[PDB]
Amino acid sequence: METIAKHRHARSSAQKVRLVADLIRGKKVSQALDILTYTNKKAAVLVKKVLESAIANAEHNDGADIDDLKVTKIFVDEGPSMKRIMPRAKGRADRILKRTSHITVVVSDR
Amino acid sequence: MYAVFQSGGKQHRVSEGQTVRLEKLDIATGETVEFAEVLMIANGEEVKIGVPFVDGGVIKAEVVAHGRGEKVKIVKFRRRKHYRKQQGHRQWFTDVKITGISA
Amino acid sequence: VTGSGKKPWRQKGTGRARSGSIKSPIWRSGGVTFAARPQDHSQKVNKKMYRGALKSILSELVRQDRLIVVEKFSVEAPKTKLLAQKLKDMALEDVLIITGELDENLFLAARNLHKVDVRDATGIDPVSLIAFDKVVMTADAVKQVEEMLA
Amino acid sequence: AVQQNKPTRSKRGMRRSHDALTAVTSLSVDKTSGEKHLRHHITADGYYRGRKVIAK
Amino acid sequence: MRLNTLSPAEGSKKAGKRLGRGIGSGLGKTGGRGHKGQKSRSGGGVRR
Amino acid sequence: MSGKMTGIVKWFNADKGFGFITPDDGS
Amino acid sequence: MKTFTAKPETVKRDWYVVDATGKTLGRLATELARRLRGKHKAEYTPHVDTGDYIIVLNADKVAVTGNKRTDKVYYHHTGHIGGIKQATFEEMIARRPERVIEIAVKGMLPKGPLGRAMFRKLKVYAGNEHNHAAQQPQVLDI
Amino acid sequence: ARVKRGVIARARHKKILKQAKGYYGARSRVYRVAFQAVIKAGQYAYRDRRQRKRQFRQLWIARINAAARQNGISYSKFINGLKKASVEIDRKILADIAVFDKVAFTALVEKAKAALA
RNA sequence: UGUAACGGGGCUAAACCAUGCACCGAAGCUGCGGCAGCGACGCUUAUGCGUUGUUGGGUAGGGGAGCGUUCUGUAAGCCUGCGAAGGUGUGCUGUGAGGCAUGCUGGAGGUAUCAGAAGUGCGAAUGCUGACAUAAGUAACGAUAAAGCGGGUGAAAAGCCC
RNA sequence: CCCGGCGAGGGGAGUGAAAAAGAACCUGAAACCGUGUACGUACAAGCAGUGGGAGCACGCUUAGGCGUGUGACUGCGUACC
Ligand SMILES: [Mg+2]
Ligand SMILES: [Mg+2]
Ligand SMILES: [Mg+2]
Ligand SMILES: [Mg+2]
Ligand SMILES: [Mg+2]
Ligand SMILES: [Mg+2]
Ligand SMILES: [Mg+2]
Ligand SMILES: [Mg+2]
Ligand SMILES: [Mg+2]
Ligand SMILES: [Mg+2]
Ligand SMILES: [Mg+2]
Ligand SMILES: [Mg+2]
Ligand SMILES: [Mg+2]
Ligand SMILES: [Mg+2]
Ligand SMILES: [Mg+2]
Ligand SMILES: [Mg+2]
Ligand SMILES: [Mg+2]
Ligand SMILES: [Mg+2]
Ligand SMILES: [Mg+2]
Ligand SMILES: [Mg+2]
Ligand SMILES: [Mg+2]
Ligand SMILES: [Mg+2]
Ligand SMILES: [Mg+2]
Ligand SMILES: [Mg+2]
Ligand SMILES: [Mg+2]
Ligand SMILES: [Mg+2]
Ligand SMILES: [Mg+2]
Ligand SMILES: [Mg+2]
Ligand SMILES: [Mg+2]
Ligand SMILES: [Mg+2]
Ligand SMILES: [Mg+2]
Ligand SMILES: [Mg+2]
Ligand SMILES: [Mg+2]
Ligand SMILES: [Mg+2]
Ligand SMILES: [Mg+2]
Ligand SMILES: [Mg+2]
Ligand SMILES: [Mg+2]
Ligand SMILES: [Mg+2]
Ligand SMILES: [Mg+2]
Ligand SMILES: [Mg+2]
Ligand SMILES: [Mg+2]
Ligand SMILES: [Mg+2]
Ligand SMILES: [Mg+2]
C-alpha cells in the first residue's frame, strides 16, 4: 500500500536536493532516517520532514506497520522560479533565479 | 529440390511450397502461371544446368495476391541553391506460391 | 498606432538589432503592415447581363418545376396561421411568393416565417429565386416580369 | 574565455558523475544508553563510550 | 440549380501570384525580382 | 517597481560608448 | 530471398602454421591478410571476422629482394616533438623481428575494430616452435 | 479573417519530429535541427538505394571468387566459361549456390572449364 | 611540427615497353514494372479512348495545375454529451502540399459539397514578446576595525537578548 | 483527523457530475528537467546519419514468421541560410 507525501514549493534547488534523495532510494525507512539524521545538508532536513509525514500518513490514513515500509519512489521536480534583479557594475543588471522544488516521497511495503 | 527462374527481369531460387514476391504480372489473383524458362533444377545431387535454359523444365505457380510495397520518400535537395523536391513511390508486386516444379 | 516616433535605442554600438520605431509591424503591439480601409465591394453588372441571368434562371425553374403560377393568392386576415394553412393546403414549406400588388395582410402573415418570403414583382432577385425551393407567381406578376424582361 | 558551443547534457551528467554523496557506513551504538551516534562522537544525550560526560 | 451547384466558366478565374510562400510555389524568396538591384527594392524603379 | 523591471534591457546598456582597447588603431 | 550473412556464433575458424623461412615478405603478408579477412571462404562477410588463426614461425628468416634488407626504413613517432625515430630492416630483425610481419599485415588489414580483431588472430614467433599444439593446427603451405 | 496559424505550424513540426525519432540530442527534439537532419536522411536514402546494388554485387562477386578458387578456378575464368557455355545465371544465385550447394557450384565450374577446354 | 615527392602497406615486379584474351567498374546502356509531358495516327472523341514514338538534371526567371487555413452563402441543413473543437498516440491511404479512421484526454461546439473573400502557410531578418536551458551549483556574498565564552528565548542560535 | 514550527506544505475525509475543477484553480502543446523499464555502451577516433546487419527484449502467431524497440560491426558520407 503506497503512501505519498509532498513538499511543494520547497525553497531549494532540485539539483541540491537530488543529491540527498539519491541516498535513500530503495532503503528501509529506519536506515533512511538515520542517514538523514547524520547528513549535513539542508535538503536532508526537508526530505526527512517529508519522509516523516509520509510515514505518519501511511500509519494513520492507510493502516501500515512502519518496520516493513520501504522507500520505493522518490523524486524531485523543478518548481516555479521566483526571479530577482541583482545589480552589477557599470549599470548592468542581472536577473538571478531563485529555484524551488517539489519533493515527492512514495513509501510502501512492496 | 530447388530451381532457378527468370521473372520480372531478374532471377529467383525457389523450392516448392515457397511464397515469392515478384514484380507485377498481368495475372488475376487466383490463376496459375507457368514459368517455362528455368535455368537450373537441383534435386539432391541430381542437378541439371540450363546451358541456355533447361529444356524440359517448367515451374507451376499460383498467384496469391497483388499489392503495393512500402512507401519510400524521394528527397532531392540542392544546398544553398533554393531547390528541393519530395516524391513518394510504392512499387506494385505480386506474391505467388509455388504449386509444383515439373522437372 | 498610438506611440512616439523615437528610436528605442541607438543605431550602433549595442549588440541588438537596428530599430527605428516602436510602432514597427514586427513588434508586439506594433502596427499592421497593410492595414485595411473601409472599402466598397460592390461590382458592376451590366443590365443585359442581369436580365440574361434572370431569364435564364426563370427558364430553369420552369424546367425544374420549381415555379407555380396561380391566379390569386390572398389571405383574409393578417394571420400567420392562415398563411400556414394555405401553404399546407398547397403542400409548400420553403417558398417565395411574388405578387404584383401590395398585400399588407400577406406581408404581416409572412413576416414571422423564415421559410417564407414575400416580394413585390419589382423586388425580385436571383439569389432568392434560387435559395427558395418553390416560387409562386401571381399571373399579374408574371405579366410584369415579362414586361420588365421583354 | 567563453564557450563556442553549447555543451550537452551528457557532458553535464558526466561532470556530475563524481558529485554523488557518500552515505555514512554504520552508526556506532552506545553500550550504556543503547542509542546510535557517530563513531568517536558523543551521543545526543551526552554519553560517550558509556559514561554520561555532561548532564543536559 | 442551387447555390451549391453553381460553378464559373473554365479559365474565368485565374489564381494569382503569391510571392514569398515557399520554394514549390516558384515565387520564392525574391519574388520575380532577382538579386540586389534597384528593381528589387521596395518602391524601386525608374520613371518613364 | 515592475515598471523598472519590465524595462531593464533598455538601460543595462546604459553608457555603452566605451571600449577601444586597440591603441594600435589598425591605421 | 535475401543475401546470406555469416553469423559470428556459427562461424568456424581453423588453425594454420606457416613457416616463413625464405619467403618474400609482402607476397606472404597479402595471403595472410587474405586468410585473416576470410576472403578464401564462400561465406565471406565484410562485417564478420571469418578468417583463420595463423601461427607464423621462423620470422627472423623472412626474405626481401633487392637492397631492401639494408635500405628499408621503418619510421615512427613517439608523440613528442623531436620524437621521430627510425630503424632499418636488419635492425628490426635483430631487436624484435616479429614486428616486421606484424606491421606488414597491419598495413594490409582493414582499419577499425574488426581489423584489430583480425590482427589478434595473427600469432608470430621468431623461432621454429609454438605453445599452441593444443589447438591442433594444420600445416599451411604458401 | 486573421488566420491564426498555431495548429498548422504545430502539426507541421510534429510531422518532421516524428520522422526524426532515434536521432541524437536536439536532432530529435528541435525542429530547426531535425528538418536539417531529415533532409540529409532523404539524401542518403536516395543515394544508398543506388549503392545497395553496388555493395551486394561486390559481395556476391567476392563469394563467387572464393568458392571458385576453392574449386581451383578464378572468377574471371569462370564467368568467361559460363559465357562460352551460354549459362545466364546471375551472381546472386551463384553466391547462394556457392554457399548452400557447393556441389552444384562445382558442377558449374566443370561446365566452365569444359567450355574453355 | 613528423615518415611525408607510390594514397598506404608493401613490390625487383605488384615497374616500364609491345601484343593479346579475360574480368571489374557509373545514377551510362539494356531488362521488368510504375508515373507524367508533348507529338503522331487512327476513334467516333464526349473533347478524351486505344496504339505509337519520344521526352522527363536544373539557379535566376517565365508558364501551367493544385493542398490546406480563417470567414460568408448553401446551413433554422447535417454531425454532436451514446462525447464537438483542441491536445496526444496508432493504423491505413494519396505522386506531393495532405487526407481518413480510431484509442486516451478533454467536456461543447463543429461543419460537407460547390462557389466567394483573404490580416492565407516561417527557420533564418545582430527579427519582436514570453518561457526555459547553457556556462554552473562555477565566480561572488561589498573595505584585512576582530572576535571568544557562559546563560536565556526558541521548532531550531556563529549572527537575537543579557 | 494526522505529520509538521499553534508553520509552509501534504495525506486523508468531505462537497461536487468531475478536485488529473482546490483558489499558484477550463483545455494545458513545446522547449526544459526528472523517475522507472528494455537494449546498447569503459581498446574506442570525425555533421552523429543512411544502406546492410548479428544479437537481445517484447508483442502478435496456428510453430509458418511477421512486427516493435535497441543497434555490436560494416560500405558511403565534411550542417542549413
Ligand atoms: Mg550606479
Ligand atoms: Mg525628433
Ligand atoms: Mg499592449
Ligand atoms: Mg495593434
Ligand atoms: Mg443602374
Ligand atoms: Mg560558433
Ligand atoms: Mg562536480
Ligand atoms: Mg538577398
Ligand atoms: Mg550583382
Ligand atoms: Mg536586377
Ligand atoms: Mg576506408
Ligand atoms: Mg521526444
Ligand atoms: Mg625532417
Ligand atoms: Mg550500376
Ligand atoms: Mg537512364
Ligand atoms: Mg518503361
Ligand atoms: Mg534525363
Ligand atoms: Mg525539370
Ligand atoms: Mg525559378
Ligand atoms: Mg458558415
Ligand atoms: Mg471520450
Ligand atoms: Mg472556430
Ligand atoms: Mg485532433
Ligand atoms: Mg477529440
Ligand atoms: Mg501572414
Ligand atoms: Mg517559430
Ligand atoms: Mg529561409
Ligand atoms: Mg531569430
Ligand atoms: Mg548551473
Ligand atoms: Mg560552494
Ligand atoms: Mg571553471
Ligand atoms: Mg574555482
Ligand atoms: Mg570564492
Ligand atoms: Mg559585508
Ligand atoms: Mg552564544
Ligand atoms: Mg558576525
Ligand atoms: Mg494547510
Ligand atoms: Mg467549461
Ligand atoms: Mg489547468
Ligand atoms: Mg511536454
Ligand atoms: Mg569492448
Ligand atoms: Mg571522440
Ligand atoms: Mg536499414
mmCIF file with all atom_site columns, C-alpha atoms in Angstrom, chain A residues 15 19-20 23 27 30 34-35 38-39 41, chain D residues 16 19-24 27 36-38:
data_model
loop_
_atom_site.group_PDB
_atom_site.id
_atom_site.type_symbol
_atom_site.label_atom_id
_atom_site.label_alt_id
_atom_site.label_comp_id
_atom_site.label_asym_id
_atom_site.label_entity_id
_atom_site.label_seq_id
_atom_site.pdbx_PDB_ins_code
_atom_site.Cartn_x
_atom_site.Cartn_y
_atom_site.Cartn_z
_atom_site.occupancy
_atom_site.B_iso_or_equiv
_atom_site.pdbx_formal_charge
_atom_site.auth_seq_id
_atom_site.auth_comp_id
_atom_site.auth_asym_id
_atom_site.auth_atom_id
_atom_site.pdbx_PDB_model_num
ATOM 1  C CA . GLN A 1 15 ? 19.884 19.695 -8.063  1.00 0.00 ? 15 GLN A CA 1
ATOM 2  C CA . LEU A 1 19 ? 21.959 14.535 -4.036  1.00 0.00 ? 19 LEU A CA 1
ATOM 3  C CA . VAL A 1 20 ? 20.157 13.746 -0.821  1.00 0.00 ? 20 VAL A CA 1
ATOM 4  C CA . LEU A 1 23 ? 20.898 8.193  -0.926  1.00 0.00 ? 23 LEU A CA 1
ATOM 5  C CA . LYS A 1 27 ? 16.081 1.767  1.517   1.00 0.00 ? 27 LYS A CA 1
ATOM 6  C CA . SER A 1 30 ? 14.848 3.361  9.668   1.00 0.00 ? 30 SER A CA 1
ATOM 7  C CA . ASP A 1 34 ? 19.479 7.597  10.225  1.00 0.00 ? 34 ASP A CA 1
ATOM 8  C CA . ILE A 1 35 ? 21.144 8.716  7.024   1.00 0.00 ? 35 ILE A CA 1
ATOM 9  C CA . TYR A 1 38 ? 23.629 12.300 10.068  1.00 0.00 ? 38 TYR A CA 1
ATOM 10 C CA . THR A 1 39 ? 23.639 14.029 6.699   1.00 0.00 ? 39 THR A CA 1
ATOM 11 C CA . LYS A 1 41 ? 22.660 19.102 4.060   1.00 0.00 ? 41 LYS A CA 1
ATOM 12 C CA . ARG D 2 16 ? 28.244 15.359 -12.191 1.00 0.00 ? 16 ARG D CA 1
ATOM 13 C CA . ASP D 2 19 ? 29.330 14.679 -7.285  1.00 0.00 ? 19 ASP D CA 1
ATOM 14 C CA . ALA D 2 20 ? 27.439 11.885 -5.557  1.00 0.00 ? 20 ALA D CA 1
ATOM 15 C CA . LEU D 2 21 ? 27.376 11.839 -1.786  1.00 0.00 ? 21 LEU D CA 1
ATOM 16 C CA . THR D 2 22 ? 28.776 9.021  0.311   1.00 0.00 ? 22 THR D CA 1
ATOM 17 C CA . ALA D 2 23 ? 26.327 7.904  2.966   1.00 0.00 ? 23 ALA D CA 1
ATOM 18 C CA . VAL D 2 24 ? 27.573 7.074  6.434   1.00 0.00 ? 24 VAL D CA 1
ATOM 19 C CA . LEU D 2 27 ? 26.366 4.254  13.149  1.00 0.00 ? 27 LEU D CA 1
ATOM 20 C CA . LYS D 2 36 ? 23.059 5.431  17.961  1.00 0.00 ? 36 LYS D CA 1
ATOM 21 C CA . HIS D 2 37 ? 25.701 8.036  17.344  1.00 0.00 ? 37 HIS D CA 1
ATOM 22 C CA . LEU D 2 38 ? 28.643 8.846  15.175  1.00 0.00 ? 38 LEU D CA 1
#
